[PDB]
Amino acid sequence: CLLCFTTYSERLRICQMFVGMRSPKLEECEEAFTAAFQGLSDTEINYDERSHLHDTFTQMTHALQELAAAQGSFEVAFPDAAEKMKKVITQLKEAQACIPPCGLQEFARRFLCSGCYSRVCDLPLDCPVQDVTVTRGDQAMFSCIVNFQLPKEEITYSWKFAGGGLRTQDLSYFRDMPRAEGYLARIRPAQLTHRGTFSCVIKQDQRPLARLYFFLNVTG
Ligand SMILES: [Br-]
Ligand SMILES: [Br-]
Ligand SMILES: [Br-]
Ligand SMILES: [Br-]
Ligand SMILES: [Br-]
Ligand SMILES: [Br-]
Ligand SMILES: [Br-]
Ligand SMILES: [Br-]
Ligand SMILES: [Br-]
Ligand SMILES: [Br-]
């Protein structure tokens, strides 16, 4: 995480304060620094903690500066700060676990220090079809509910219908169902012409987080 939360100029300035502006050791110093953090090069942290960690690294830089200004060897200074940061990292709050089988799960997002970028679970947007069997004249209810946490802001539910009795996730068979809004869709009453797949797209603003599918089997 050293490379992600400190810049090359900061690290060069630290090493110069250690050995000198244009010292021949100035190169070795560099490789003592980065190597000292080699173990933390592939850690994954809770995305929501990145700022915190970055701030901590800022503190670290200053702590090193003073250490260099007061003589002090870089050879011991860098492993020391590396272990301090290792403990800081171990005490950070964890992101939520990935929950199968589908969805963009923002509360599971993690920051990868190897590459310095964020990542959610590699799950499909489309969730498995849920079979819902009712009889003619009976009420049917589709709950657009996922098993992972959704953001609070800007969530909408868009419904679609693929008729003709198709059990399908293929979008080319669906038309929009503008009557339906919200997480709960009701067919009152269900009839044979409702046979088909109902889909609900959960969106944050305009980006989809999940697409659910309900195959309504209406029985005579
Ligand atoms: Br940050
Ligand atoms: Br020292
Ligand atoms: Br985590
Ligand atoms: Br939120
Ligand atoms: Br909505
Ligand atoms: Br089918
Ligand atoms: Br449409
Ligand atoms: Br409609
Ligand atoms: Br409702
Ligand atoms: Br979509």
Residue numbers in the entry: 27 to 246
What text comes from the article?
SPACA6 is a sperm-expressed surface protein that is critical for gamete fusion during mammalian sexual reproduction. We elucidated the crystal structure of the SPACA6 ectodomain at 2.2-Å resolution, revealing a two-domain protein containing a four-helix bundle and Ig-like β-sandwich connected via a quasi-flexible linker. This structure is reminiscent of IZUMO1, another gamete fusion-associated protein, making SPACA6 and IZUMO1 founding members of a superfamily of fertilization-associated proteins, herein dubbed the IST superfamily. The IST superfamily is defined structurally by its distorted four-helix bundle and a pair of disulfide-bonded CXXC motifs.
